[PDB]
Amino acid sequence: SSKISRETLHQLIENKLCQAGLKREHAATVAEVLVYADARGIHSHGAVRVEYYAERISKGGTNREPEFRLEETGPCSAILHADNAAGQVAAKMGMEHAIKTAQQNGVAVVGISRMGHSGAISYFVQQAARAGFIGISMCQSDPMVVPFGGAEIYYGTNPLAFAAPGEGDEILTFDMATTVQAWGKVLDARSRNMSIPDTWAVDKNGVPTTDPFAVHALLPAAGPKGYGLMMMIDVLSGVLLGLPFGRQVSSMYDDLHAGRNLGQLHIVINPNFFSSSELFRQHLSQTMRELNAITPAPGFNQVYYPGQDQDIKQRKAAVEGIEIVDDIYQYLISDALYNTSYE
Amino acid sequence: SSKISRETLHQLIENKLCQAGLKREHAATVAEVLVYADARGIHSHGAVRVEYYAERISKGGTNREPEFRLEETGPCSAILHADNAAGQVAAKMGMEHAIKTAQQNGVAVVGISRMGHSGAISYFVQQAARAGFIGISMCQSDPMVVPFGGAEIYYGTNPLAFAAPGEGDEILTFDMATTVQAWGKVLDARSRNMSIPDTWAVDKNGVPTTDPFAVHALLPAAGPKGYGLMMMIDVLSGVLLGLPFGRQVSSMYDDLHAGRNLGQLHIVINPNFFSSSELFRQHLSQTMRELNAITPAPGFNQVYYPGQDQDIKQRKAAVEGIEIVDDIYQYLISDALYNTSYE
């Protein structure tokens, strides 16, 4: 394993995505959202995804000339038609509009209609926080989860993200998928014959397993609860947006030449429209401080506030760089667009 | 376990809350939210709590003459200062203002500032879905949970609810506590020396236990996830409203003479400002139907959609009346304000 500066990694990704077809302005936005993930230790959403993105952009499955349209439907609501643009581009754009609206009218609910994969969604809610607002976000994902007590796939790992401002540079960020584990993990254990916890995934019959090769679908986190959340996220970023929903949602490998048509929903709340933002920021910082002060149980060195472990990594990254798997580096500096295909 | 009609139950409760000091109209509201709960099988939030509400109303711990004040802060935002009025009354008022705002302006975020316990929170989101809107609600609660990896309590079981309109009278209702299980359940097994799943609670050291008498605090659902979820709910319905938050949140049995000062946040979204409401409703009904037709796993006679089990119970209750514990029933028909004190 190697470590590289944020800037070099940003450029490598940006150049790669340009070379595959995106306008540079687009490639650079995608890149920034990926570098963000890696600096926070979220490698699953980092530079490892560049090769698959390039293959898709290259084949027209991500729109390189999107026809954006921001349809404002009311004082605090709006839909950003993204014409299947890269999810990072679409979602950042949508959130910017939301921030604008909430800044003026206290609140904003903005839909992102027909986009590709937008990345670690904590990046978008952090936009809001850096602007001093509470930010909430969620989106649909590839079908991969059985409902509670079920044996067929229906919903995706539909993530939900949240972020709120503290004092100074302090931001509280919480991100979470609705399944116990992420499918990628099942594939890794697939790599190394390695076995897996009986809570991660279920088989074709819906029975849990320790055999990653026997896995057919993931399980919802905390059973009925995760299941209800993913359904909720599907209702808020899909059905509400008239987009495909549930098992109709496109999957990554369906058709690299076709837009994903995914939906995303942002909610922004301006604390000034509810009470002192100054006391809001002071109390969020106080929350951070207290939780972190709590006596840890055996097996723990400390108690971290939600997302703190990622904040620490992000800070270190801005100084020592970002860790990147050597193969990815070699892929980035090579001339290939994609070696292994997702066809 | 007698069986009585909602009408009878609702009247009994109403009278008893009146006798304690509440105005008929507020008691009527409290009673209907409580009957709602029992009808859904949510006994923990039903008539079992009348005795404790009577005693707090009697000692002034619940403002009997609340001076309500609805501060409209913007086009789609508002705060209902409740003056430590009864939670069912306050949350319903707020939701009403939310429903009206979203009707005109597509979206509404309303906070309920300083109220007592508002019962089964799914009741309020159902208000929104009966009106054809999407409803989301969440509120703070009595500190009972250790943070992920922690050994002292901080947050409460902070619940979350959501509901959306299907075709015709159909409604999809989802609600959830952020802990694996409710404190009540620890009490059940405790009041009957029954070991419990080591996922529910932890000992005084922060180490999960199987012995209910060893339970010192509850565990957050799915570990870090419910941990982030309770924090989010706390920031949204507490810190956002300038109310005590986290460990500051008042406990039920602390001071029967003091206002609880709880907060609650409602978010309503008018499907019309985002796409075809009739298509929305039609898709929600499709979601319900298809989840029901999913091949169930070995050990499930069938797959239910979120909250369906409670939907079933509610329907039946309106026909077969509600079951009520003898202890609770004889208390409601007697003239006593309460037979025991909740400290």
Curated annotation (Swiss-Prot), chains A, B:
Q: Please name the source species.
A: Escherichia coli (strain K12)
Taxonomic path = Bacteria, Pseudomonadati, Pseudomonadota, Gammaproteobacteria, Enterobacterales
UniProt-annotated catalytic positions: H117
* Effect caused by changing D142N: 6-fold decrease of the affinity for (S)-ureidoglycolate, but same affinity for NAD compared to the wild-type. Strong decrease of the catalytic efficiency
Query: Does tRNA processing count among this protein's keywords?
Result: no
Mention one GO biological process in which this protein takes part, according to its record: allantoin assimilation pathway
Q: Tell what triggers its expression.
A: By glyoxylate and allantoin under anaerobic conditions.
Q: Where in the cell is it found?
A: Cytoplasm
Effect caused by changing Y53F: 2- and 16-fold decrease of the affinity for NAD and (S)-ureidoglycolate, respectively. Strong decrease of the catalytic efficiency
Q: What is this protein called?
A: Ureidoglycolate dehydrogenase (NAD(+))
Protein family: Belongs to the LDH2/MDH2 oxidoreductase family.
User: Which NCBIfam families does this entry report, sorted A to Z?
Assistant: AllD, PRK15025.1
- Give the positions of the site Plays a crucial role in stabilizing the binding of (S)-ureidoglycolate: R49
Q: Which cellular component, as a GO term, is one annotated location?
A: cytoplasm
- Top-level taxon of the source organism: Bacteria
Q: Name one Pfam family in it.
A: Ldh_2
**Which keywords does this Swiss-Prot/TrEMBL entry list?**
Cytoplasm, NAD, Oxidoreductase, Purine metabolism
Q: What's the effect of swapping R260A?
A: 2- and 12-fold decrease of the affinity for NAD and (S)-ureidoglycolate, respectively. Slight decrease of the catalytic efficiency
- Provide the catalytic activity annotation: (S)-ureidoglycolate + NAD(+) = N-carbamoyl-2-oxoglycine + NADH + H(+)
Q: How the protein assembles, per its UniProt entry?
A: Homodimer.
Residues binding NAD(+) are S141, D175, M176, A177, K225, G307, Q308, D309
Its job: AllD plays a pivotal role as a metabolic branch-point enzyme in nitrogen utilization via the assimilation of allantoin. It is able to utilize allantoin as a sole source of nitrogen under anaerobic conditions. Catalyzes the oxidation of ureidoglycolate to oxalurate.
